[PDB]
């Protein structure tokens, strides 16, 4: 009683395992060295540490189980009932942690540049540690619906085989559709809005200041850091859109099609696209330390001096 197994080309599977292991080692080393560096203004440090922490947790928790339980053993849950519940709870709590961290960092930069007094009053290390603990608690509360919706179900030929058991939303399609579509709706269309518009008006302020920097009498070799700030700004916004759009387009695709439209080709495309979407979310969670590293070439020096 073995069905629902998807017969893919093994060279594509080996080639995406190699990508997954490369993102694994790069994200773990980058996030480990950034937390050690930030651990050795204070609020943006705790914000970057919280986002890097959430990305390290999404890698070390989600990566090896998703690896072993979708790539190698494609059908059985290795981890049991609480394993499914804890996996989707962690995964979605980390997704809300990452999305709300990038929201908070973009509001903090918009605050830090366009409202300096209001950012002075909104920022205190007591308030920032309370705020990050609040945002981790809110990501856990918004991940409680991935606890109660999800579970085990046996979809064998008669529903009684011990290997026909899968890990699936055990609720009907309308409830599934509303829960997953409000997740993708608020968790993505609100961070795309705040990141895009805030970072756009920051980039406007920085490009006007660059055009007022080309004060050449005052200026040392320090117009590189303003262009680098424009580049890191734009790298943040573009990386967040490109890395967290296909995952929710995939979940939308799971959300709307009621199986009357599914074929074998879209079935196979969905499984390969699932692999690619988890590749992109791990590209996000691994390329945060990269594009915080490479722009701050003195903080980068601090990284490589502590590493050497």
């Amino acid at each position: 009683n073995s069905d629902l197994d998807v017969n893919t080309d093994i060279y594509s599977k080996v080639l995406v395992t190699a990508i997954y292991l490369a993102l694994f080692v790069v994200g773990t080393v980058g996030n480990s060295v950034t937390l050690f560096t930030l651990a050795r203004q204070s609020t943006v440090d705790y914000y970057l540490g919280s986002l890097a922490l959430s990305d390290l947790l999404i890698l070390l928790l989600a990566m090896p189980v998703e690896l072993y339980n979708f790539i190698w053993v494609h059908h059985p849950w290795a981890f049991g009932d609480a394993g499914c519940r804890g996996y989707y709870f962690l995964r979605d709590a980390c997704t809300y942690a990452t999305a709300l961290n990038v929201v908070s960092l973009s509001v903090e930069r918009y605050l830090a540049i366009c409202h300096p007094f209001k950012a002075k009053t909104l920022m205190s290390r007591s308030r920032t540690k309370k705020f990050i603990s609040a945002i981790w608690l809110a990501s856990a509360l918004l991940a409680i619906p991935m606890l109660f919706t999800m579970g085990l179900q046996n979809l064998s030929g008669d529903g009684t085989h011990p290997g026909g058991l899968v890990c699936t939303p055990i609720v009907d399609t309308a409830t599934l559709k509303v829960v997953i579509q409000v997740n993708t709706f608020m968790s993505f269309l609100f961070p795309m809005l705040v990141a895009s518009i805030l970072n756009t008006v920051i980039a406007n302020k920085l490009t006007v200041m660059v055009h007022q920097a080309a004060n050449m009498t005052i200026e040392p070799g320090r117009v590189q850091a303003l262009r680098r700030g424009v580049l890191v700004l734009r790298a943040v916004v573009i990386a967040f859109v490109v890395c967290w759009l296909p995952y929710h387009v995939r979940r939308l695709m799971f959300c709307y099609i009621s199986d009357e439209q599914w074929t074998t080709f879209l079935f196979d495309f969905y499984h390969y696209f699932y692999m690619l979407t988890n590749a992109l979310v791990y590209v996000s969670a691994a390329i945060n330390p990269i594009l915080y590293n490479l722009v701050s070439a003195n903080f980068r020096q601090v990284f490589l001096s502590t590493l050497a």
């Binding site: 979708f70 999800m150 179900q153 899968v166 890990c167 799971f254 199986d259 599914w262 074929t263 499984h271």
Partner: peptide, 6 residues
């Protein structure tokens, strides 16, 4: 044929 994958 519905994928259970999510």
């Amino acid at each position: 044929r519905r994928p259970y994958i999510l």
